[PDB]
Amino acid sequence: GHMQKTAFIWDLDGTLMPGAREVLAWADESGIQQFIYTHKGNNAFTILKDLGVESYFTEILTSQSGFVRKPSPEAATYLLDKYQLNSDNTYYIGDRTLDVEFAQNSGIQSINFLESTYEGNHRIQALADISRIFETK
16 A cells, blocks of 8 residues: 555566466556556557557557667666656666666666565566565665
């Protein structure tokens, strides 16, 4: 509960997703702004519609976006000014070391299943640890 201006970011590469509709629903009512970025095309929107979860993400960037390759802080600096968000209160949801290289560059946080030696990266073991993070100081 409560939840300040906080933002969430997903991908469409493996991270409809048996276990995610929990966290999606929690985050949605919590007034977090979810987003996506992936290399996948304008079909991302259509797949999201198909699966019934399109509205669970404020904006879904795609190959259309044209933004730089990882590390690409460009794409997060967009996401901030889109709705006046805070990098330090945006929590990406990754699986990789690379999912923390760009995080550092942007000055944004990550919630990733492995440590990557960064003061903004939270280790986890399942998607349901996301809700715990905001529930234990």
